[PDB]
Structures are given as structure tokens and as C-alpha cells.
């Protein structure tokens, strides 16, 4: 980012090429979820409909702005002063104020922003086509990446509501137990949901029991979040509470997990290790 103040000793054509690449990589359309009165009783369907709506509206806005960029770069349209400032920001590598429509790491590159936008839009397309093919029932069965959702806090709330409706239980008698299974495609319980996209920090998982590691991070396999009835069970001394931050800067929290100390080590060692759970690196 050094060379864009006075090192002028041709950005339109390069911006045209990268905008053509952006149009190539971003998917064209995001179809909205069809709403029925039977499906609207499912909070999973409610949350997924809201996310599909927000993602498709943002998709339409970004496709329209990209179309404006490519039409101006093709010599068919003209961009005004504020859009010239937008061009300056896109050249200099700063995400403008008209794109922070969800939760994202602060001060990151626009190309990676568009790349993870493409990934999450592909995830939304997958879940939308699964919903269209099967209904609200398959919304529980389909594994959903936690970090790729716009609001995974509302996702875990939605799974809470789904098990509450399924077992006709109040939302003060439910608690979350974390089951990181190395097995892929495990038989999901009616209270258990499949979540990928997690990665552990400062620790490694071994049969739902942590151990200290000198590595930077570990690749967490298919996680299962299970809502079991909160009994009055005494908490063990070998149980450790870890945050699940969304990103690396770790400014906002998603939810808390409970894992098990395996060997002699103090959970104070985990705490001073700063063992966290990240959704994005």
C-alpha cells in the first residue's frame, strides 16, 4: 500500500480485469426460500429464511455495484464523485463504508472479503437448494459451517428452539454439551446438530479430551452441538470453559464450550495458554 500517494513516476483497465474476475467468481443469483404456513412454525426455517433473504439482498446489491463498475470500465457508463472515491478506495485496498453489512474481521483486504463472500454465498446457495428440495426437516440434517453464517449466534439459538419444540421443553431446562467427533457423518441425535468450520487454538482434541500442543492451531473435525436437559450435576474439576470467537482479533463472542482435561495438567495451564476456539483464522 506504499506506492499510491505520489509514486506516479492505468488503473481503469486493471480494475476492469479484476471486476471481470469478481463477476466470474461471485455466483449470479441467490433464490429466496419459499415460505409455507407449515414450514414457518419451524425456527430453523425462520432463521434460514432470514439469512437467505439478507444474503440474497446483499448479493443483488453487490452484483449491481459490480455491474456499474464494469459498465463504467467498459466505457458505457460514468461514475460520479463519490463513486470515484469508491474507485480510489478499491485501488488503495480499503473496504469502503458501503460494504460492511455483516460481521467481518476489521481492516482486511477487499479481495479476501470478496473471496469469503463468495464462499458464504455458495454455502447459502447449498442450504437454500437443500431447503427447496427437502423442506424444514432437512435443515436439521444438513451440516452448516458456523463461521460462514451471517449470524451463527442466531443459528445456535435456532437449534435450541428446534429441540425445544421437538421435545416440548421450556428454554430454561436446556444446556449445551460439546461433542467434537473425529468420525465424519455420525448419526445425529434429535438434539444434536452438525457444525463444521471450527479450529482450536493452543490445544488439540483427542476423544473429546484436550491436550496442550505447541502448534499454532489444530483443524477441528465435524463438531456436534447437543442440547441435553440441564440436570443438577456437580461440575467436575477437569472441565474447562473456552470461548468461541468468530475471528482472530477476538473482539466479539459467539458462545462457550466445555471440554475435558485429559492428563495431569491444570486448567489454569489452558487458561494461561489462551486456548480459544476460532471460526475463522
Amino acid at each position: 500500500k506504499m506506492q499510491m500517494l505520489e509514486d506516479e513516476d492505468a488503473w481503469m483497465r486493471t480494475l476492469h480485469t479484476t471486476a471481470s474476475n469478481w463477476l466470474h467468481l461471485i455466483p449470479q443469483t441467490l433464490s429466496h426460500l419459499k415460505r409455507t404456513v407449515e414450514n414457518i412454525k419451524d425456527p430453523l426455517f425462520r432463521f434460514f429464511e432470514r439469512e437467505v433473504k439478507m444474503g440474497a439482498k446483499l448479493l443483488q446489491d453487490v452484483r449491481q455495484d459490480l455491474a456499474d463498475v464494469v459498465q463504467v470500465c467498459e466505457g458505457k457508463k460514468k461514475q460520479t464523485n463519490y463513486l470515484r472515491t469508491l474507485i480510489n478506495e478499491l485501488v488503495k485496498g480499503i473496504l469502503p463504508r458501503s460494504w460492511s453489512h455483516y460481521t467481518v474481521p476489521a481492516g482486511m483486504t477487499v479481495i479476501q472479503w470478496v473471496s469469503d463472500f463468495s464462499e458464504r454465498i455458495k454455502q447459502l446457495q447449498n442450504i437454500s437448494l437443500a431447503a427447496a428440495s427437502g423442506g424444514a426437516k432437512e435443515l436439521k440434517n444438513i451440516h452448516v459451517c458456523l463461521g460462514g453464517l451471517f449470524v451463527p449466534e442466531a443459528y445456535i439459538t435456532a437449534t435450541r428452539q428446534y429441540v425445544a419444540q421437538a421435545n416440548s421443553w421450556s428454554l430454561e431446562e436446556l444446556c449445551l454439551e460439546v461433542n467434537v467427533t473425529t468420525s465424519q457423518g455420525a448419526t445425529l441425535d434429535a438434539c444434536s446438530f452438525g457444525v463444521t468450520g471450527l479450529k482450536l487454538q493452543g490445544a488439540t482434541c483427542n476423544n473429546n479430551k484436550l491436550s496442550l500442543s505447541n502448534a499454532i492451531s489444530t483443524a477441528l473435525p465435524l463438531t456436534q452441538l447437543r442440547w441435553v436437559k440441564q440436570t443438577n450435576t456437580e461440575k467436575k474439576a477437569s472441565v474447562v470453559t473456552l470461548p468461541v470467537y468468530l475471528n482472530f482479533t477476538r473482539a466479539d463472542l459467539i458462545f462457550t464450550v466445555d471440554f475435558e482435561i485429559a492428563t495431569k495438567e491444570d486448567p489454569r495451564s489452558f487458561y494461561e495458554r489462551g486456548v480459544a476456539v476460532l471460526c475463522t483464522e
Binding site: 425462520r46 432463521f47 449466534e153 442466531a154 439459538t157 421450556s170 428454554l171 430454561e172
Partner: protein, 1206 residues
């Protein structure tokens, strides 16, 4: 000197201190400042001769007794007797607390305590002193417990203290199901709220197994070391928080809300009290709805210091912040600065500098080298010396969401307020109000509000914070007490034994809480969110149903008033169930709160719900209802809420202030009545700061003069606001909300109202029979009151199938919904235009049958004429705003979906056809006047050469001037709209025209000026009437450009709200006399461009709701050829040899003009626009060439023509 003698004239203004010192005998004038002067003091108790201060009166009716009352006569110095009043107030607080702790020694040393003796103690002693005595008793018995332990490990005294607190709380839980006054009930609430916290402390100590007197496991809790034998009154009570050794400030708190000692507040008190011992400051940050400033308030209450939160959310006062600081330092006070980061740069840096100076001046006490034997503490507040008290504190609260100020990152020990224990707060409030199962229902209700704020669709009028939870729990406690009273009365009337505990055991608490939640929040919910929220609430509260509070009496009164007011009705879920539920919710909120918001958009029925509620309550309770629809944007701020003369002081009465003065005086005696004041039009936060004190707990109209106007429950201030998009959060939280969704004022509702009002309203009667509705009710024997009324009823019966649910009009309206018009579409506008057209159709039948006195027209002619007029009217009402292309396509859609016969010409637009006085069709071209203008003036036609468009437009201007409706004429500039307005308006002799153009900076001071010049004021027995000076002469005020005046700072323009109130009410509230008037002989009409054009502000739906709209396009080919053929035929008479060239001249001219306009369009260059104005400039040029010339050949004529074209 005045500060040194009495430091309490300082938070209130210089004029206030001047009237205080000049009106020393005006105790009623002086008692106005106590509400903001003290923590909870409202006034003072004085003698009949005002010679002895008997006590102090609170806001909630508490009257504290004085064990040594002050006498004012022997101390004539004002500041001296005031200082003696507060000093003896401290002394009496200390002595009453001494007696109260003496008796609560026996209270706490007894295993069983008589509930009646307990209630007697509560009633005798004040709220502050009773909670302080509970504190002192518990802390002293646990001090005796620990000193008797002495390291021996004896758990018996701690167990006995815990059992004592448990049995006392059992007494509270058994006596809480009674009925009490508000003051005694609040004392009970505060006592149980603190005693459950002391229970928590004792459970914590017995779980920790502490056995030491000076152990920190006990030093980290709320300690009250009391010494009744102390000589000094302030040092009798000591509040010691770990290291800190403070003393309670014995000032009368009054009835102030006590906030619960949660662990977060416990850490907050820990940090701030340790900071104060260290002589630093405190500065908690965090988001909203967490408890920062009220936790500061709770600490200030529990220590006993004057807490006055200085909020500065765009409401700062830079000249008074320094006075705030000097007052804090001089008296000893705790000032929380809620949301300090929302301050602008220069004054933020200035106030940061002053607070830094104050913090360092406080820090001068921290070191031990600066001895307290000789301590002249000094500080600067804008070049002055101020001594800082050793007990004041400044708490600069921050609200990130930004960090601490640069000068304040080191002097203020900051704390993080992020997430309060809402489960704990719900549990303690349920247990304190009297709920037997507090914890389970609390832990159900706390995920509920976060769940709502997550799952519900985001809107501004929603709220789910902890203040909202507190108000919902207050409502739940009140409903629980009411249900207890009802069950007790029912068991008393029936034959059965009465036992409050037995009936409370078998009593549905989940039903009470779900009912209170629904009654507080459901009326603010849009119809989109209702079934999802019921499924949400059934998930959180399984098996718990919500029963609607049924009022069959008000249901019957509502049904009678609705049948009286030409409406429909429904008993729930029917056609009318939604509106009935909405108006009943309006009744519930008017009973609960003293003023609410109706926040439906335009076309909702909020005012009709309001009026039908007023009349139904009239017929129910016999309480006479008064309506004052004061419009806030109809007069400026000073005229609305009164103003002062800068010299020779006289309070001239504004509108709202005059209404409030009249109702407080109540010469007619309106306290027995029910007066309702409605602020129609949307909400603007520039006339709410005066309403805040009126609507708050003070209920006073504060004035600079000093006159206080109370608010009885006779006054209810409702609002009819279109949207709260520009409303403050204070107004969001203060008043209840009944959101009128647009799908409750249905098309069937609109149809039925039109049909019934037509069937039973006489049309030409006017002002005589409007006031004769008081005389008689039905007029039996007058079925044919007029032949036009027989026609109205017959036409309504004929058109009944066309105003159905799935009717032709409904389909046409929903198609015009998905069509496009330049102005902002409104369903009520389309329907109102259609109804006015049907009214004029009836008027046409009436005039035809009056001009045919031999016979009126038969049923067949009636049916054909009204059906054809109905198709004509729906076309001109729906597609009448749009351009010709989609106006024609809506004509085609009407043709393809209609059942009425239509003109047989396929390639001719249906809109180009006139309905005859007979039952058949006839084009306007058959009867267009083919005039021949004089050659004296042809290029500037003061009269229009008639064409298809001109005759259609003049006919419908007549139609919508007859019913005196306003009319707007939108379209591209130069389309002859002002000309057709002038021609059709001056053609009829019944009305005059006063042509006025609104500029961008117009105010209806101009309209009042033109009413003063062109009319006069006449007084009638029926009211006040504004009428033109010339008798029997209607006055149609004219508007060249309605769109042109600029919007206000919040997107609502005065000039259009004025005409809105004219067409809605029929009058305005005056400014000089502040009286209601009625427009008897006035109309309105205006012209516009489309709002996409640059200087054209789009109009409000509030005004566009009424006015019908017509699109004046460019005349088109046949119209242009006709009018300019007439122009040139009557123009070429200057030369007699060229009579046969006018038609080729016009044909060539208009063909060249049309092709030039089709080629050159404004999308390339902004100035490529063409209109018949330049065509008449062309004709003027040809005439100016041909006039001074005797003769000219055809070649010269074409040369002049082409020269002018070039």
C-alpha cells in the same frame, strides 16, 4: 457569601433566585424547585401561618414528621432558616433512625414478629429510615455473631441470624398478598428487596464457613457499623467497604427507587468506594440497557448522597456544567455523566479539562503528607476558587458501541459493564412483588426478551431492554394484586371461606405473567410478527395460554357507536375483529398510562378508533367527552407551547398552554368530564422537550414565569403520528404504542363506510343540518327526505355488488397498485377520489331532475348512468395520476376485467369518452366548442381554445370543486395546467380565485395574511366562522406550486400540513385568539410538477391521503392540430390573400415540432425539452412579422415560418 451561607441556590437559575429573594413570603412560589433540588423531595410541610416547618412532603404523598421542627419567624434570614431546615432535617433523620433501630433490635431479636406491628412500623417510619434500620439491625446482629464467635468456629449465631432473616422474609411473603397504599407498598418492596440480598450474604458466609471477625470474606459485603451513642449525627452510621471507612450522609432521600444489589453492582460499589477512599474517580463503560447510571444511583442511595444524573445526549448546557461542578464540590453530591462520549469536540475538551481539575483537587486528599488539620482545598472553575468536599464523586460514564477521554484515562478507575444478571433481577422483582414462584418464571422470562430481540423483525418502535422488563414486572404485580382482589370479592359474594394463602396457592402465575407481557407488548406488534411471537412464547412458556381481557360492556357501546357512525363491526377475527382489538388496546393503554402514541401509517383509522372509543366510553360511563385536536406543526413552537414578552412581562397564552390553563381552571367543571387532547400529524422532536415535564412524573407544564399546571387523569394526551422514524428514544419509552397496521382498515371497510354515509347523509344541507344532528335521531317518516337522497340510496343499492371483497373496484385498485404514477400512491386517495366522483354523479342527477320538473329519470337510466360513471370514475381515480400510456393500459385492463358495457370503438381510448346525462356513451370531441378567436389577441390566449383534454379537465375541475375537495394537477411543465385552472375557475361565477404562488420559503403567515385581506371574521352561536367579505361568494384560494416550499429539518413541510388540517378538520386554531374556527366558504386547489423534477419536494402521504390528482400531459397530435389550426385560421386574417394556407402551415409546424421533440430529448443535454409555450412564442413571432406588413407572398410566408423555426 451567598454560596458560603447557603450553597443550594445554584442548580436553579438566576431569575429563580431573584424571585426567591424578592418573594420570600411566596412559599407556594418557592416550593416549585424541590423536585430537582433534592433526590425525592417534592415539597415541604409548613404551618397555616407558615411559621413552623412541620415536615417534608414527598412525591408519593409521604409526610415525614419532625422530632424537632424548624421555626421560620424568629430567623427572618432566608438562607439562615433554609440551612436550619436542612440541618434539623438531618437531626430528625438521625433521631428517628435511632428510635427505629431501637425497636428493630427487638424486631430482629424475636423469632416471631406480629405482621400488624410490622405494618405499623412501616407506616410510622419513612422508606429511607426503614431500609436503613433493616441494614443496621442485620449488620449489628452479624457483628455480634462474629464477635461472639471470636475464632471458635461456632456456627450457631450465624445460623440464628440466617433463620431470623428467613422467618422475617416468610412474614413478608405471607403479608405481601394483601392490599396496601402505594407508599407503604413501596416501603415493603424496598425492605424485601434488601432483605433477600442480606439472605444471599448469609448463605454466602455459611457456604464459605467463615470464622473470623476481620476476614475479607465478610469485609467484601454490605457492612453497616452503627454507633447510636455517637454525638455527631453524621458519624453515627458508618458505611465501611473493605479499606474504605465512610459515613452515611443523612439527607432525606424521599421515595427513590432502590436498585438491587446484584454481584455486578457489588463489584461496582467495591471499585467506586475503593476509588473514593483513594480519592480517584470512577468511570464505568459499556452498552445500553445494562445499569451504569442507575447502579451509580443505587450506590448514591445506599450511601445517602444527593444524586443528580447529568445526561448530555444532545441536551447539554455548557454555561451550567461549571455550576454543576461547583455545586457538587460545595454540597457533596454524586453526578453521573451518562453517555459522555456523545459530546462535541471543543466543549468536550473543556468539560474534560474541568473534570480533570476536579479529580486532581479530590486527589489532593489522597496523600497523607497533606495533613487534614490544615486543609484549604482549592480548584478552578473559570477563574474562581472552589473548595471540594471530601465526599463528592464524579462518575464519567462512557457508552462505546468511544474509549475513555485522553485526560481521563488515568484519573478514573474504570469498570466494564457488559451483561447484568437479568435472571437475578427478574427473580428478585418477582419475589419482591409477591410472586410465590419467582425463580422458575424469572428464568423463563429472561431468555424471552433476548429471544424477542433476536428472532423478531427489527423495527424502531420495539423495545426489549431491562427497563422494559422492569415495567412489565410492575404491570405483572399490579395484575396479580387486581386478580387477588377480584378472587376475594367473588369468594366473599359466594358462600365459601376466605383464605388469601389458600387462594394464592391455587392461582396461575404463568397465566398472570403471560397476560401482563401480552398486555404491555402485543399492541406494539405488527401483524407480521404475531404468530411467530405466539409460537415463541409457547416455546418459552410451554402449555401457558393468554386469555384476552374481555369487556362486553365497552363492546356493546362500541358496536352501538359504530352503527351510529356508518361503519362495520366484528366480534373478533371477523371483518372488524382487528380494529375492535386495536381500539380496546387503546382503552387499556389510556387506563394504564396518561398518554400514548397511535403510530399507524396513513390510511389506518387511528383517529376513528380514537373517536369511536370516546363515544363508546360516553355511552358507557356517562362521562362527557371533549376533543382538542391540537396540531403541533400547524403553529410554530412558541405559539404552540406559549411564549413570553421580552419586555413588560406578560404570559400570552399559546395553544396547548391555553387549553391546559382552561382545563385546570375548569369553569365548566371538566374534572367530571373526560378531556382528550390529540396531536395529529407525525412526531417531531423539536416540540417534545416541553412535553417531557408534562408527561413525566412531575406532570407539570414548566414555564419561565413560574406557573405550575398539574395533569389530572382527566387529561389524556394522545398522538396521531404517521411514523416515529424521527422520534427520540425517550418518547419511544415514555408512552404506550398501538401500531395500526395498514391491513386493519380494509377495502371492505372503506366500501361499507362510503355506501352507508351515502345512503344516510343529505348532501346539499350544509351547516344547518350539521348542528341539527343534536335534534332528533332518525327523522322517521322521511324516507324520501330529498329526491336526490332517493337517488343516492338507489345508486348505492345498484353499486353494492361493485363494492364487494373480490369486486371490480378492488381488482382495479390492486392493479393500479402495481402500476406507476409520478406522485406517491395512496389507496385512500384513490378511493376518496372515486367517492367524490360518485357524489358528483348524484349531484348531476339532482340538478338534471331539478331542471326537468316534469319527471325524474327512471331506474334504467339511473343504472346505466351510474355504471358508466363508475367505470369512468375508477379510471380517472386510479389511472388519472399516470402518463397516457399506462393510463391507457389500465383502461385496457378495466375493459378486460369489467362487466359494464363499454364504447364499441376498438382503437380509441376509453378515457377519451364522456358519460352523458342519459345512459349512453358520447365522446368529448362531439361537443368540444370549436371557437374562433379574435385576431386582436391570438398568440396569448387568455381563454383556452377547447380541445379533448381541456374539456375533460374543466369538467372534472368542476366536479372536484363542487365538493370543495382540494385538487392537485401534476405533469410536465408547460402542459397548460395553470391555464386550464384559470379558465375553468373563472368560468363559473359561484367562486372567486385568489392566485398565490408558494415560494421555497413560504409559511402560512402568508395564508393568514391573504385570509385577513380577502376575508373577515364573524362570530356565531355555533362557534367562530371565517368567511369572505363579499356575502354569498365562495373563495377558492389558489396554489401555483404546492411542491415548491422546502421541507423542515425532519421531512415534513408546514404549508402542506396546514392544508391537510384544513381538509381534515375544517378549520384551524388561531394564534392571536387561540380559538377554533370553521371554514364555511373556502376551498383549496393547487398545481405541481412530478417530484422526480429537481426543485419538487415529494408530498406527504398525510396530505396526499385526501387530495385527488390528475396528470396534465402535453396535448398530443390531434389536440395540437386542432388548437393551432384555430390559432392560424383566425391569425392569417392580417393578409386576405392567404386564406388557404393556415391548414398546411399548422400541419407542417406541428409535424416538425413532433419530430424535433422525438429526436432531441433531454437525456443527452439538459435543455432539450419542448412544449406549446415555445409554439405560442413561434406564433407570436409570425404575427409580429406579419402585422406591420401590408401583403406578403406564400414564399415570404414560408421564409418567415422557417426563420422563426430556426
Amino acid at each position: 457569601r451567598e454560596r458560603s451561607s447557603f450553597p443550594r441556590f445554584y442548580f436553579v437559575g438566576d431569575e429563580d433566585l431573584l424571585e426567591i429573594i424578592g418573594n420570600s413570603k411566596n412559599v407556594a412560589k418557592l416550593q416549585k424547585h424541590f423536585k430537582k433540588m433534592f433526590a425525592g423531595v417534592s415539597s415541604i410541610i409548613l404551618n397555616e401561618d407558615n411559621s413552623v416547618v412541620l415536615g417534608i412532603s414527598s412525591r408519593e404523598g409521604e409526610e415525614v414528621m419532625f422530632k424537632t421542627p424548624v421555626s421560620i419567624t424568629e430567623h427572618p434570614k432566608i438562607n439562615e432558616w433554609l440551612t436550619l431546615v436542612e440541618k434539623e432535617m438531618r437531626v430528625t433523620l438521625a433521631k428517628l433512625l435511632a428510635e427505629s433501630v431501637t425497636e428493630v433490635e427487638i424486631f430482629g431479636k424475636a423469632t416471631s414478629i406480629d405482621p400488624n406491628t410490622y405494618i405499623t412500623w412501616i407506616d410510622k417510619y419513612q422508606a429511607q429510615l426503614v431500609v436503613l434500620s433493616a441494614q443496621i439491625a442485620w449488620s449489628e446482629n452479624v457483628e455480634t455473631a462474629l464477635s461472639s464467635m471470636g475464632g471458635g468456629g461456632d456456627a450457631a449465631p450465624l445460623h440464628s441470624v440466617l433463620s431470623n432473616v428467613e422467618v422475617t422474609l416468610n412474614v413478608l411473603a405471607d403479608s405481601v398478598l394483601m392490599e396496601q397504599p402505594p407508599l407503604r407498598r413501596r416501603k415493603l418492596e424496598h425492605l424485601i428487596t434488601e432483605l433477600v440480598h442480606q439472605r444471599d450474604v448469609t448463605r454466602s458466609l455459611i457456604k464459605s464457613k467463615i470464622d473470623n471477625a476481620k476476614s475479607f470474606e465478610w469485609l467484601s459485603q454490605m457492612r453497616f457499623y452503627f454507633d447510636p451513642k455517637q454525638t455527631d449525627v453524621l458519624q453515627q452510621l458508618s458505611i465501611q467497604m473493605a479499606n474504605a471507612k465512610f459515613n452515611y450522609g443523612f439527607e432525606y432521600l424521599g421515595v427513590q427507587d432502590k436498585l438491587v444489589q446484584t454481584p455486578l453492582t457489588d463489584r461496582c460499589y467495591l471499585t467506586m468506594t475503593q476509588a473514593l477512599e483513594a480519592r480517584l474517580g470512577g468511570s464505568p463503560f459499556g452498552p445500553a440497557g445494562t445499569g451504569k447510571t442507575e447502579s451509580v444511583k443505587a450506590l448514591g442511595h445506599q450511601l445517602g448522597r444527593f444524586v443528580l444524573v447529568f445526561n448530555c445526549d444532545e441536551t447539554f448546557d455548557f454555561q451550567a456544567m461549571g455550576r454543576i461542578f461547583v455545586g457538587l464540590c460545595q454540597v457533596g453530591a454524586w453526578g453521573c455523566f451518562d453517555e459522555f462520549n456523545r459530546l462535541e469536540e471543543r466543549m468536550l475538551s473543556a468539560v474534560s479539562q474541568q473534570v480533570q481539575c476536579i479529580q486532581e483537587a479530590l486527589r489532593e486528599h489522597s496523600n497523607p503528607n497533606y495533613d487534614k488539620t490544615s486543609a484549604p482545598i482549592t480548584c478552578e472553575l473559570l477563574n474562581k476558587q472552589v473548595k471540594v468536599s471530601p465526599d463528592m464523586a464524579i462518575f464519567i460514564t462512557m457508552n462505546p458501541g468511544s474509549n475513555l477521554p485522553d485526560n481521563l484515562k488515568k484519573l478514573f478507575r474504570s469498570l466494564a459493564m457488559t451483561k447484568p444478571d437479568r435472571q437475578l433481577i427478574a427473580q428478585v422483582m418477582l419475589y419482591s412483588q409477591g410472586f410465590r414462584t419467582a425463580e422458575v418464571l424469572a428464568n423463563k422470562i429472561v431468555p424471552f426478551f433476548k429471544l424477542c430481540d433476536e428472532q423478531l423483525s427489527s423495527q424502531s418502535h420495539y423495545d426489549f431492554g431491562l427497563r422494559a422488563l422492569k415495567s412489565v414486572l410492575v404491570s405483572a404485580g399490579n395484575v396479580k394484586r387486581e386478580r387477588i382482589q377480584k378472587i376475594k370479592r367473588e369468594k366473599e359474594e359466594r358462600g365459601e371461606a376466605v383464605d388469601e394463602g389458600e387462594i394464592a396457592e391455587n392461582l396461575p402465575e404463568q397465566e398472570i405473567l403471560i397476560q401482563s407481557v401480552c398486555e404491555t407488548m402485543v399492541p406494539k406488534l405488527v401483524a407480521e410478527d404475531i404468530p411467530l411471537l405466539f409460537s415463541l412464547l409457547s416455546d418459552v412458556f410451554p402449555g401457558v395460554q393468554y386469555h384476552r381481557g374481555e369487556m362486553t360492556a365497552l363492546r356493546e357501546e362500541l358496536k352501538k357507536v359504530c352503527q351510529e357512525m356508518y361503519l362495520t363491526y366484528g366480534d373478533g377475527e371477523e371483518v372488524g375483529g382487528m380494529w375492535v382489538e386495536k381500539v380496546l388496546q387503546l382503552y387499556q393503554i389510556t387506563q394504564i398510562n396518561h398518554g400514548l402514541m397511535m403510530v399507524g401509517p396513513s390510511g389506518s383509522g387511528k383517529s376513528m378508533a380514537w373517536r369511536v372509543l370516546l363515544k363508546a366510553l360516553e355511552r358507557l360511563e356517562g362521562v362527557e367527552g371533549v376533543a382538542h385536536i391540537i396540531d403541533p406543526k400547524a403553529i410554530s413552537k412558541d405559539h404552540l407551547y406559549g411564549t413570553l414578552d421580552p419586555n413588560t412581562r406578560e404570559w400570552t397564552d399559546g395553544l396547548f398552554t391555553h387549553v391546559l390553563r382552561k382545563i385546570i381552571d375548569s369553569v365548566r367543571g371538566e374534572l367530571q368530564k373526560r378531556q382528550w387532547i390529540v396531536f395529529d400529524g407525525d412526531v417531531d422532536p423539536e416540540w417534545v422537550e416541553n412535553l417531557n415535564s408534562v408527561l413525566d412524573d412531575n406532570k407539570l407544564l414548566t414555564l419561565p414565569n413560574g406557573e405550575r399546571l398539574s395533569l389530572p387523569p382527566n387529561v389524556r394526551i394522545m398522538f396521531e403520528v404517521q411514523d416515529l422514524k424521527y422520534a427520540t428514544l425517550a418518547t419511544v419509552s415514555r408512552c404506550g404504542m398501538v401500531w395500526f397496521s395498514e391491513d386493519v382498515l380494509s377495502t371492505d371497510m372503506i366500501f361499507n363506510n362510503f355506501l352507508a354515509r351515502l345512503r344516510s347523509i343529505p348532501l346539499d344541507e350544509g351547516e344547518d343540518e350539521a348542528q341539527r344532528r343534536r335534534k332528533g335521531k332518525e327523522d322517521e317518516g322521511e324516507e324520501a327526505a330529498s329526491p336526490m337522497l332517493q337517488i343516492q340510496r338507489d345508486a348505492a343499492t345498484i353499486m353494492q355488488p361493485y363494492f364487494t371483497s373480490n369486486g371490480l373496484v378492488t381488482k382495479a385498485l390492486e392493479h393500479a397498485f402495481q402500476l406507476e404514477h409520478i406522485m406517491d400512491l395512496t389507496r385512500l386517495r384513490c378511493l376518496g377520489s372515486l367517492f367524490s366522483m360518485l357524489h358528483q354523479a348524484c349531484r348531476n342527477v339532482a340538478q338534471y331532475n331539478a331542471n326537468h320538473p316534469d319527471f325524474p329519470m327512471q331506474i334504467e337510466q339511473l343504472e346505466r348512468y351510474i355504471q358508466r360513471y363508475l367505470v369512468y370514475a375508477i379510471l380517472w381515480s386510479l389511472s388519472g395520476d399516470s402518463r397516457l400510456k399506462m393510463r391507457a393500459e389500465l383502461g385496457e385492463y378495466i375493459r378486460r376485467i369489467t362487466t359494464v358495457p363499454l364504447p364499441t370503438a376498438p382503437n380509441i381510448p376509453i378515457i377519451d369518452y364522456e358519460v352523458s346525462i342519459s345512459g349512453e356513451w358520447s365522446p368529448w370531441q362531439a361537443k368540444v366548442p370549436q371557437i374562433e378567436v379574435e385576431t386582436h389577441k391570438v398568440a396569448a390566449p387568455d381563454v383556452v381554445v377547447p380541445t379533448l383534454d381541456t374539456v375533460r379537465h374543466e369538467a372534472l375541475l368542476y366536479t372536484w370543486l363542487a365538493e370543495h375537495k382540494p385538487l392537485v394537477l401534476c405533469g410536465p411543465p408547460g402542459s397548460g395546467k395553470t391555464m386550464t385552472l384559470f379558465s375553468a375557475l373563472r368560468a363559473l361565477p359561484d367562486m372567486e380565485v385568489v392566485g398565490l404562488n408558494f415560494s421555497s420559503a413560504t409559511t402560512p403567515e402568508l395564508l393568514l395574511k391573504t385570509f385577513d385581506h380577502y376575508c373577515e371574521y364573524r362570530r356565531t352561536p355555533n362557534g367562530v366562522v371565517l368567511a369572505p367579505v363579499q356575502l354569498g361568494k365562495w373563495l377558492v384560494l389558489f396554489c401555483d406550486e404546492i411542491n415548491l416550499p422546502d421541507m423542515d429539518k425532519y421531512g415534513t413541510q408546514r404549508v402542506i400540513s396546514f392544508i391537510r388540517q384544513m381538509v381534515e378538520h375544517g378549520g384551524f386554531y388561531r394564534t392571536s385568539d387561540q380559538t377554533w374556527v370553521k371554514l364555511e366558504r373556502i376551498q383549496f386547489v393547487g398545481a405541481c410538477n412530478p417530484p422526480t423534477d429537481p426543485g419538487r419536494k415529494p408530498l406527504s402521504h398525510r396530505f396526499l391521503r385526501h387530495v385527488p390528482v390528475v396528470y396534465v400531459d402535453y396535448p398530443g397530435p390531434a389536440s395540437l392540430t386542432q388548437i393551432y389550426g384555430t390559432f392560424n385560421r383566425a391569425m392569417l386574417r392580417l393578409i386576405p390573400s392567404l386564406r388557404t394556407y393556415a391548414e398546411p402551415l399548422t400541419a407542417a409546424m406541428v409535424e416538425f415540432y413532433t419530430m424535433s421533440q422525438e429526436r432531441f430529448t433531454q437525456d443527452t443535454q439538459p435543455h432539450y425539452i419542448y412544449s406549446p409555450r415555445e409554439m405560442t412564442r413561434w406564433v407570436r413571432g409570425i404575427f409580429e412579422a406579419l402585422r406591420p406588413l401590408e401583403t406578403l407572398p406564400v414564399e415570404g410566408l414560408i421564409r418567415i415560418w422557417a426563420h422563426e423555426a430556426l
